[PDB]
Symmetry: C3
Subunit: 340 residues, 3 copies
């Protein structure tokens, strides 16, 4: 909500309290999403100041507070800053921002990251360019310097983040996206490549000095209908774990497909149908194996802009004999959301 707007500066202080519960069978160790309380809250601010008629400065910060921990020792589990960046936007020359932000390959993966609760499975955090990452310098142009309405592009510089863990690290890299929107249609293409750290190369799964990710996207977004498809491939970038062996690393290559179809009724209801499949190829010792593979059916009911409820159901197609130990059980999520 906009809580301040004076002298050229506007601040939006936003957040949500999500009462959320996952229903699966087991111990929930063989299901898609897990089981039990998943309640969380979000808090963030978004600021924008008009320096002059052509120049805008902006900043954004967003945090995740889990609401399913006790008030004991595990109290901070899962808490974290999601976004933290500041930038400048100038006329039709473009915008530049630096900090913790979305990788450029999410410019394409955002097309299908619209399910009520699940979906967006290949947009991993701290995984080069597909999700939220630290230390990215992003340059974005809209409408090709004001000359081609609807044609955008971006280039992103990713600085090395040598962390304690192979999973959360990355070396330097460069990525870019180009997209075109016209009358409800949109097409995007996005590609990133980066070096891998020593710690990443010491991992038993995956071999290579460079990580690459690319995705394509196609959508139709108008007349209360939302249809979108993504196709992407990664080399040495998708994090995987062999549960049997307890060995971890990156998939040599993945081939990813995500499809979503939703419809927004005027009275508030928004059904959703999706299909997601991600398969790893050439995994040392396993060969080809599915990482993700389901059908989704769900609905969101929007009481208004501040309140909603949803049910999200994953009809998991992972087989029980999946070679990496990837869970095969279904998951149903039910949620009540207040937001401002």
């Amino acid at each position: 909500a906009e809580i301040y707007n004076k002298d050229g500066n506007k601040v939006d202080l936003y957040g949500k309290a999500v009462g959320l519960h996952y229903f699966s069978k087991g111990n929930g160790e063989n299901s898609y999403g897990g089981n039990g309380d998943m309640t969380y809250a979000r808090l963030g601010f978004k600021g924008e100041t008009q320096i002059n008629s052509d120049l805008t400065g902006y900043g954004q910060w967003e945090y995740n507070f889990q609401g399913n921990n006790s008030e004991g020792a595990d109290a901070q589990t899962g808490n974290k800053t999601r976004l933290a960046f500041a930038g400048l936007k100038y006329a039709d020359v473009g915008s530049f921002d630096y900090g913790r932000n979305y990788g450029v390959v999410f410019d394409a993966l955002g097309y299908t990251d619209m399910l009520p609760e699940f979906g967006g499975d290949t947009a991993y955090s701290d995984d080069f360019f597909v999700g939220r990452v630290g230390g990215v310098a992003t340059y974005r142009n809209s409408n090709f310097f004001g000359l081609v309405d609807g044609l955008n592009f971006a280039v992103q510089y990713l600085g090395k983040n040598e962390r304690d863990t192979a999973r959360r690290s990355n070396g330097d890299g460069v990525g870019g996206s180009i997209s075109y929107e016209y009358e409800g249609f949109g097409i995007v293409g996005a590609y990133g490549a980066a070096d891998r750290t020593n710690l990443q190369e010491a991992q038993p799964l995956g071999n290579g000095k460079k990580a690459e990710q690319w995705a394509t996207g196609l959508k139709y977004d108008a007349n209360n209908i939302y249809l979108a498809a993504n196709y992407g491939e990664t080399r040495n970038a998708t994090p995987i774990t062999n549960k049997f062996t307890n060995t971890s690393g990156f998939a040599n290559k993945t081939q990813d497909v995500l499809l979503v179809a939703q419809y927004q009724f005027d009275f508030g209801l928004r059904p959703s149908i999706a299909y997601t499949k991600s398969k790893a190829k050439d995994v040392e010792g396993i060969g080809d194996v599915d990482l993700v593979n389901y059908f989704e059916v769900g609905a969101t009911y929007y009481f208004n802009k501040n309140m909603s409820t949803y049910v999200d159901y994953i009809i998991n197609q992972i087989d029980s004999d999946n070679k990496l130990g990837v869970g095969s059980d279904d998951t149903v999520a039910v949620g009540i959301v207040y937001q401002f």
Copy 2:
């Protein structure tokens, strides 16, 4: 404070900065409350949106930031989300919310949880139904569907929270409260029962498959006078530790009494007198032993709605030979509170 109210949505962003210091003798390892700096801050939001004339949606989130840690390694000690829930309220049919919220037995224990600093000793966090807990689904009715003014009830469903620690866990359970208010008087009754996890049953103190808690409450709240009494009993629910042995678990049964008498002067001062006693019975190897036992004398001075100061003094009656090692020294707390 209400910082936003537009288009049917109102957001209250609230908080406090509490400069707080406990005074006790020792090393403060044999006193009631401890000793030294206890400064903390609170931040929270409360939202409510009017969907239509009969239907309200709401959400609340509240966090505790300790202000007595260094900026080093111990910086997060004691920080945590206290509340995180969202719900819907419909006409006279009732309200339903889900998330981290107060257990239904706090519907009765809240009567005497009014001391300036201490008190509310049996309303433990993450302890089934007596305090703040995760994964509770709460249904509350006011005025018996609009037919009986002042008669309320609630039913609460508690989902299993299988945590790392016996102390912070719980199995499934159901609890309820009924209360009646009339012209300054109020009477409540509240009861909850839940399964205990394996980890809870593996503990050396306490034996049983089910945890039960109930409390009764009586109050008089009018004419600047506040008088309240609680009587409650628990089976297998109150967490205890034998400091000598360093063995921990739950008290087979407890018998709890809490009394409070306060008076609010018009000029700002609010003296308080209270008495609290909680005794465990049938503790393996100890027999009957006091957990809590004191007299309280205190005062709060309210400069206005935003500022106050208080002194809270605990005249501890625990004996020095208490068998579980429960501290016997007095504690004095002094506090300066700014809130919004």
Copy 3:
């Protein structure tokens, strides 16, 4: 930004999102500031309520959220409450506040703590009176009870904070500051002395039962010019580490000098030149050694009150053979700041 002002209470909710990157050579283990992403965000509130015409109550809380951690296990690294206090201000009698606040010796060290990114090197956190500390009771008088315009003083009581670490602990102590301001000129003097804990005395570096810190300050602050000098000395208070040996403790004595010269152009640019040097003396086994020693050159460009960018460059004069292992490489910091 002031987001609430009604019925005598005003709340300022403030913050910033700082996209920040340090450039140094190495592994950055021999540079002044380190290397890589240093993005962070700040969130805080400042409240003030007018109780009556002579009496004001106030509270402040401020937190640091790092933006250069992954969303994994290291997510909280560096997060912490910086300030948390509440107080009362009465007419010309003075103000009193208690909580986590700046030590009184920062009353003098604040003179030169004005660099764009670095500087303020001897104002360590959780180090008795020179920086932010927990459990301080501060009394401050302005204009000598309203009788001497520009003459101020403060007295501060520091309570023992017996922490897990020698570095973040302190015993009881008392400190004070006196300062005088007149037509752009300001002179301050500040001194604090405290007991040291057992854990502090068990450390291999430094010998003594009491920690002392004092600093003097002189500034000229008017006509867009800012010039300031600090001179200070510490006994048993400055934390040091011998990287070779991996032994840690406090410097027996330090002699500290800090100089800053800045100029504010009307168009937004504010160049800065500074010099800082801190030398430890009588360090067990080393003799005299430099802790800090550089020249700074930098600039901040202020687009307006909400947006700025800066470059801060440290021309390090530490030699490569420095006996404690103190880094000798330069550091360049570049920052884009949105604030509200």
